[PDB]
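Supplementary Methods S3. Input chains for the assembly prediction are listed below.
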Amino acid sequence: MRLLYLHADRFEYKTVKPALKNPPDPPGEASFGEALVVFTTVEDGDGPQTVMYAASDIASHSSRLKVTTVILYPYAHLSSRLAKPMAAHKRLIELEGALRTKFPGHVHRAPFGWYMSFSIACKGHPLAELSRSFTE
Amino acid sequence: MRLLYLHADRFEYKTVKPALKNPPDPPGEASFGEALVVFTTVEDGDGPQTVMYAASDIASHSSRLKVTTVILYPYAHLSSRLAKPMAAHKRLIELEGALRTKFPGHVHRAPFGWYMSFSIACKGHPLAELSRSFTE
Ligand SMILES: Nc1ncnc2c1ncn2[C@@H]1O[C@H](CO)[C@@H](NC(=O)[C@@H](N)CO)[C@H]1O
Ligand SMILES: Nc1ncnc2c1ncn2[C@@H]1O[C@H](CO)[C@@H](NC(=O)[C@@H](N)CO)[C@H]1O
Ligand SMILES: [Mg+2]
Ligand SMILES: [Mg+2]
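Predicted structure tokens for the full assembly:
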């Protein structure tokens, strides 16, 4: 699993065209204030331990930043060892579930299987942009 | 070299704190309209052929998108096989030079060695977000 953590002042997204034949999540949009935006690429090796490591790390980083909202943003482009779309969606659902057991704030999972527009205003402080890798 | 191509409606950045002891580029800011924002991670293996492959690809993609502005945005987070900061800066300078020989529009190289704030509005069409890898 490869993640990119972006500490935003604001964030918003809108699904546009379906990127998959039948996206498993409905279309939609959302916007937010201050949040940790976690761009999330699910990789072949990812299973339940990977999900829980990533959940624990996201919660600790958010703790460090004093963030109270986390956006799990599906992202196909951080890795060249991608899981298949059904496995990725399953892992991302698991990740959202896992994160709720470790982090007390708002967790939002953006829909899976769509092309997106987004806007972000990413903060400039030293810990505002970081990447992570998890395996098992 | 690992790149992320984001076809933006708008883009802007501002240097904040120096991320290196002595950033080799002066502080600053810029904003843009429609552009291809190329987040660029220079890797250990990168040399002159890598630079030219990446220049040629950026020019072709921009051609496909009918983009007339390209932003070369230094980005430490796309890879876990990073070049050292001096080599990376040299490669990025070379990349800007190379791109000017293949692409007729505006090329802007964002400064190197800084923490940045940025804002992007990334388009939602199918080719608006893509990643690339170059080696030699
Ligand atoms: N291994 C993987 N990990 C995470 N997400 C994955 C995935 N495989 C497919 N997706 C999702 O399907 C869309 C098209 O690739 C992806 N959509 C996107 O990456 C948009 N942000 C592009 O505009 C994403 O929803
Ligand atoms: N191998 C590498 N490839 C590309 N850029 C590199 C690099 N090594 C260092 N940098 C630059 O130094 C800043 C701190 O890591 C980097 N700054 C950034 O990545 C900001 N966007 C963070 O806010 C970048 O300017
Ligand atoms: Mg809509
Ligand atoms: Mg300034």
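Residues A 129; B 19-20, 40-42, 74-76, 82-83, 85, 88, 112-116 surround serine-3'-aminoadenosine (ligand 2) (CB under 6 Å). Chain B touches chain A through 25 residues (CB under 8 Å).
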